[PDB]
Amino acid sequence: HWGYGKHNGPEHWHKDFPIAKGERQSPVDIDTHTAKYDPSLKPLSVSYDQATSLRILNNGHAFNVEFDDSQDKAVLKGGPLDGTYRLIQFHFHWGSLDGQGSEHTVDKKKYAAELHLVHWNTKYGDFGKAVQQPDGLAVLGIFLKVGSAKPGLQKVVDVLDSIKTKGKSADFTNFDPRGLLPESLDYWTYPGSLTTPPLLECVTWIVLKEPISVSSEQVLKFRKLNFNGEGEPEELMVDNWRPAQPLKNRQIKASFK
């Protein structure tokens, strides 16, 4: 099965998922000088006040913080988007070392980690139908650098001991994802894909320019998670990132000058 090891990592995924070599794959390098300001983009609207988190799950590739997406409770709209996109989960990608871990890069710079807040277009009814559409998902990507602690991340960090291994979940109610956002909502946007198999080309990416800072202790706790299940040989969950893919026939647009 696919993963992030030498024998099953990103360079192998195309054998089971040929779209891995497709025309709109993610992540990409964001070349800041080539991205063009688009004055027709609108401000992002991130409306998370009524978010209902439910559970946190180690799925063997990352951990997902899952939300109730059966009503418009936590939604993303505006920016490049037409319509309303409902938050279903967030997760991170991170490195074994502070100098790598992000999926997107900025002028080839790798951040220590990257947060993905995943939303689906309500016009398609359910996430499973949305991923079959070219405008099915909107993913808000936020870079993490190591410095000061992010207070709003600590509740996530502290539950990780209870979901160490693949297949473990824990109750995770009343978590406010607003505590993971930077000050500015300036962003880059482009059409792309899921960054894990099945790699479907269904995502409008919105990548924030401003990173958030997390502490060394916080990222060290991410690195104590395991890819394996309980009772199996320990393989630390680190370096769960796909590298940048060819931009091909795409333009990255900036919301800011």
Annotated binding site for substrate: 195-196
| Nearer to Zn ion (CB atom), residue 116 or residue 166 | 116
In the numeric block, which tokens belong to residue 197? 């198999």
Question: What is d(CA 236, CA 96) in angstroms, rounded to the nearest whole number?
Answer: 9
Nearest distance from C-beta of residue 10 to Zn ion, angstroms: 13
Tell me the binding residues.
91, 93, 116, 195-196
Alpha-carbon distances, residue 126 vs 129, 130, 138, 197, 251 (angstroms): 5, 6, 14, 19, 29
Number of residues that bind Zn ion (CB under 5 A): 1
Q: Are 16 and 197 in contact (CB under 8 A)?
A: yes
Q: What pairing do the DSSP bridges indicate for beta strands 85-94 and 63-67? A: antiparallel
- Contact by Cβ (8 Å): 84, 77: yes
Name the minimum Å distance from CB 204 to Zn ion: 14
Nearer to Zn ion, 77 or 116 (CB): 116
Q: Given the residues 7, 14, 61, 104, select the one marked as catalytic.
A: 61
By the rule CB under 5 A, 209 interacts with Zn ion:
no
Cβ closer to Zn ion: 160 or 203?
Answer: 203
Q: Is the dihedral of CA 162, 168, 173, 175 positive or negative?
A: positive
Annotated binding site for Zn(2+): 91, 93, 116
- Residues within window 91-150 making contact with Zn ion, judged by CB under 5 A: 116
Q: What are phi and psi of 50, to 5 degrees?
A: -105, 15
Q: Kindly state the smallest distance separating residue 138's Cβ from Zn ion, in Å.
A: 13
| Smallest separation, CB 90 to Zn ion (Å) | 9
Tell me if residue 14 is catalytic: no
Instruction: Choose between 9 and 38: whose C-beta lies nearer to Zn ion.
Output: 9
Cis peptide, bond prior to residue 27, ω within 30 of zero: yes
Give residues in contact with Zn ion (CB under 5 A): 116
Residues carrying an active site annotation: 61
